[PDB]
Ligand binder design. Sequence first.
Ligand SMILES: Nc1nc2c(ncn2[C@@H]2O[C@H](COP(=O)(O)OP(=O)(O)O)[C@@H](O)[C@H]2O)c(=O)[nH]1
Ligand SMILES: O=S([O-])[O-]
Ligand SMILES: [Cl-]
Length: 323
Amino acid sequence: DKAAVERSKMIDRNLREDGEKAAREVKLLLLGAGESGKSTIVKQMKIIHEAGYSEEECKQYKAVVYSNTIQSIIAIIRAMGRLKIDFGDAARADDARQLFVLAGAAEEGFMTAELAGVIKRLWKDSGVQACFNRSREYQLNDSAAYYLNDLDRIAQPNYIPTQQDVLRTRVKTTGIVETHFTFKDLHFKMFDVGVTAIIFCVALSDYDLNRMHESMKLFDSICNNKWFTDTSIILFLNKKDLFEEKIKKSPLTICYPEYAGSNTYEEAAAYIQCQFEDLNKRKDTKEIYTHFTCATDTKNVQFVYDAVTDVIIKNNLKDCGLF
Ligand SMILES: Nc1nc2c(ncn2[C@@H]2O[C@H](COP(=O)(O)OP(=O)(O)O)[C@@H](O)[C@H]2O)c(=O)[nH]1
Ligand SMILES: O=S([O-])[O-]
Ligand SMILES: [Cl-]
């Protein structure tokens, strides 16, 4: 292990009376466009490094799960009208109406056998499925399929959200979120918006929604900024799972008209990676550390973060103070 050898070369703890107990601090900036996966990464840090989410904590997210699900089905049904897409079985029009009656009379997210029934039949309808598959034409939660396909479990009277259910939530976050965790004896200070490292998140599946080019313009700015010269810049190309499902049927050319590679996961994901890394104007001075992630996948984030941490250890320790 080169990172272990590297950190063992430090001597600054010896300048402190109780140096071996001192906390080495790493400030990490979590950046990226809305819905790029920043909150999800923060949640994985709690899960992997700080003992996860207990059941009682998971119960607090129940009505958020309900709310996300309701939002999803409504967005699809409403889009059917704008896109002129007919129901398969014409009796679903009553279920569509009933969905609005129930959502319209309620205080917040909820679930009943009646609502579950309405939504199940809607999600199973061929016309609804056809509208769902044109989601790129409107605005729809990426977890729409996840919750809807599992509606039966979510709908049970004694339903308790799983960690995956909580990770899959979209929560309206405002302002700056700061989280703290210890890993490999490093005391991380992570800021979801002069720093040790930046993690920049990109939603790969946004390519056909222009979102990707806005993500690029933002990365161009950040990557090449003055304050970040000695900052380790990490690129998370996220939602690789949604990208892989989607790249089979929707072409990269929608985002990058000049693209002439095959429309496969391997070629299209590589191309995207190059588009972002090429935005680095100091190529011989700064390296970009790129990882393809699925932020909802605890194992993948654990692995990826372990590698991101070895890079910080080999590269940035000298600028990390003791406290
Ligand atoms: N399938 C999938 N969903 C993801 C991934 N990353 C984030 N999400 C979901 O995308 C939505 C937005 O993510 P979020 O962390 O809130 O983005 P933020 O605005 O940058 O904080 C949430 O519902 C997440 O559950 C991913 O890699 N794969
Ligand atoms: O001294 S290093 O191991 O934080
Ligand atoms: Cl989303």
